[PDB]
Design a protein around this ligand. Structure first.
Ligand SMILES: Cc1cc(=O)n(C)c2cc(NS(C)(=O)=O)ccc12
Ligand SMILES: Cc1cc(=O)n(C)c2cc(NS(C)(=O)=O)ccc12
Lengths: 109, 109
């Protein structure tokens, strides 16, 4: 199906991103205990669990919307963290992986 | 000087980004001749010359608008190019630099 081909492709892509070694910082909403003041600085939090739910809730009706949420995961991380932190490093490694999977899927608007 | 402090800060930041060694791929619009199918995949092209113009035209009335344009330069490049390409490398080097200058200016809280 035309909306169900999108769903399948995104579910595949998201699952692969989630299984990647460098995804571990981004699997759930940042915990206050782990990052006090994070939620005062970061206005639009995002994480892969929230993305999983959004996907199951049929929110990702286009490539644009999926891309923006995943990209926000990376840009939040780069805004909050210093450039040579492990968190920043993971974000760029996983972003590379992300873009290779997007392209591998022939994913388009 | 409340809108003109913003202008000054942005002009400084943009100039520094433009003077950086790794900015050379992003100084003018991607040419169709030099990149096949680029404009089919990349929906919102952006570059530092267009940003210079937008700045000179008083388009950047907020930090948000400036951030989005410059971020898009990087994310366009990373979506389109393979991860070990010189273009992708430049993008991450210059993105690091960018986030350091933004933070240095107190332009993210
Ligand atoms: C400190 C910190 C920054 C950050 O950008 N992320 C994504 C984190 C993730 C963490 N893991 S978790 C269990 O809160 O999702 C812990 C600390 C950070
Ligand atoms: C193919 C290509 C990709 C890219 O991301 N950028 C920024 C380019 C820049 C180029 N230089 S220019 C002078 O056309 O803007 C040429 C090709 C590419």
């Amino acid at each position: 199906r035309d909306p169900d081909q999108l769903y399948s492709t995104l579910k595949s892509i998201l699952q692969q991103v989630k299984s990647h070694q460098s995804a571990w910082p981004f699997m759930e909403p940042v915990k206050r205990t782990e990052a006090p003041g994070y939620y005062e600085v970061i206005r639009f939090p995002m994480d892969l669990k929230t993305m999983s739910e959004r996907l199951k809730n049929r929110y990702y009706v286009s490539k644009k919307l999926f891309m923006a949420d995943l990209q926000r995961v990376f840009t939040n991380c780069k805004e909050y963290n210093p450039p040579e932190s492990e968190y920043y490093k993971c974000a760029n490694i996983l972003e590379k992986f992300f873009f290779s999977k997007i392209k591998e899927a022939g994913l388009i608007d």
